Amino acid sequence: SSFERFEIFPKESSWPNHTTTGVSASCSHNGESSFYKNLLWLTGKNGLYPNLSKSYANNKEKEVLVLWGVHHPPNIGDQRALYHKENAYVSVVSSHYSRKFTPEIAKRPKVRDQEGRINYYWTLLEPGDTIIFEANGNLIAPRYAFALSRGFGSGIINSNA
Amino acid sequence: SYANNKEKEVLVLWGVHHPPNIGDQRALYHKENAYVSVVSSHYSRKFTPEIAK
Amino acid sequence: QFTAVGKEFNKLERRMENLNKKVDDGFIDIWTYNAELLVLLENERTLDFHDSNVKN
Ligand SMILES: *[C@@H]1O[C@H](CO)[C@@H](O)[C@H](O)[C@H]1NC(C)=O
């Protein structure tokens, strides 16, 4: 019924000790490497991945849809090069959502010229609620959240008309 | 690792063993704490033995 | 009312998919049988109505 794409974590202020310039070849725009616009790939800056801690309190009088992801490097060498730690975690804590994600490093079949997948998770935040993101690696952090008010529960149509 | 090439769906079964006492685990697998990681493109789980009488 | 009769289920929720399919097929069966029988019976009633008008 009303959809608003807004900044939940502005890249300028939010992450001071992380490069947040990571790009991917599979996500290619005009021949240059690129990445998603609503998510930012975090990476260690100056050779370290400091313990992350972020909080967002909802005050939009609306439900807020938040997307994020967890990165699984293909080999242990990729994890060492990127996040500088063999074992990491991602804790997402809400009033009604709570999960811990652990990277699973494994050699996987090549799709889109990549060897290690990343998983995408989402959550809905109620008005007056707070969501906390913590990690020390493998976090594909949110950039833009989506404040929405649900309407008549419709569906989708696959068509070429 | 097993890569599917049968042009068909493949049903795979496995199991995880929980010894009754810590002595059984020590005798069998020689390690107090173990794990079982099953990783697929759409399936992913880690299992930890739970030893209890 | 406003409804969307299409649902999407993954590969670990086939009981739900078959329950939804059963609901859809049962509704289709009920509506088809009722509509066909109703049309037949009302056609008979309408022809009898015209016959009664002529006889009256
Ligand atoms: C960055 O590191 C400094 C100390 O070097 C610390 O005070 C600050 O909280 C860190 N920022 C984040 C976002 O972790």
Side-chain angles (χ1 to χ4, degrees), chain B residues 10-29:
Chain B
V10 165
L11 165 71
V12 185
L13 278 295
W14 71 97
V16 171
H17 170 66
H18 311 294
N21 33 45
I22 211 87
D24 205 353
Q25 171 96 37
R26 219 76 59 56
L28 281 168
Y29 310 103

Side-chain angles (χ1 to χ4, degrees), chain B:
Chain B
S1 297
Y2 173 79
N4 189 24
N5 50 329
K6 290 258 184 175
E7 311 119 329
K8 286 157 157 188
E9 324 206 279
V10 165
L11 165 71
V12 185
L13 278 295
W14 71 97
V16 171
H17 170 66
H18 311 294
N21 33 45
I22 211 87
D24 205 353
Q25 171 96 37
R26 219 76 59 56
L28 281 168
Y29 310 103
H30 317 304
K31 296 189 310 294
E32 284 211 322
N33 271 328
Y35 70 98
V36 182
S37 308
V38 175
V39 161
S40 163
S41 298
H42 300 266
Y43 188 97
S44 299
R45 256 188 93 159
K46 279 180 64 72
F47 315 91
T48 289
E50 31 197 305
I51 298 177
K53 185 56 170 23

Side-chain angles (χ1 to χ4, degrees), chain C residues 12-27:
Chain C
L12 189 74
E13 294 184 328
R14 172 161 263 81
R15 284 174 301 158
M16 306 234 294
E17 168 180 339
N18 278 308
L19 172 51
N20 170 36
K21 181 184 308 308
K22 173 167 67 168
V23 172
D24 279 348
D25 303 0
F27 280 146

Side-chain angles (χ1 to χ4, degrees), chain A residues 14 16-17 50-51 54:
Chain A
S14 298
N17 313 333
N51 294 359
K54 296 289 173 183

